[PDB]
């Protein structure tokens, strides 16, 4: 497991920035999904369950002003940066594993 920091800017205003940290890359990708699912939950408070296509989650990520992460590398004790498109791919891989 590599400690992972997620940097989030939902809109063009930097006043909305936040960050989160996770024990692994996988937990970070699970966290991105949870962030979207919380958005859907507040949009649909009366729905006990929601199904979405991965494309909807990717649309949501695309529409974020900024999303990136930083993955701890033990061999240099530094953080490797990865951008939105890298995150989306790791989410696809995660969800495919989860489905199986």
């Amino acid at each position: 497991m590599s400690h992972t920091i997620l940097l989030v800017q939902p809109t063009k205003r930097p006043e909305g920035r936040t960050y989160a940290d996770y024990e692994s890359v996988n937990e970070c990708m699970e966290g991105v999904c949870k962030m979207y699912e919380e958005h859907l939950k507040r949009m649909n408070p009366n729905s006990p369950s929601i199904t979405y296509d991965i494309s909807q989650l990717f649309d949501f990520i695309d529409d974020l002003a900024d999303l990136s992460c930083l993955v701890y590398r033990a061999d240099t004790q530094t953080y490797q940066p990865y951008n939105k498109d890298w995150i989306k791919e790791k989410i696809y891989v995660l969800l495919r594993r989860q489905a199986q």
Binding site: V8, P10, G16, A20, G31, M35, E38, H39, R42
Partner: peptide, 30 residues
Amino acid sequence: PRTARHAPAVRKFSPDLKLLKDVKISVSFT
């Protein structure tokens, strides 16, 4: 001997992006 310090479990932080907050629509009928 120093005192051992216990506290409640820290909840995992899950950001609420508040994307619907103050989102309004105005409709004119004229």
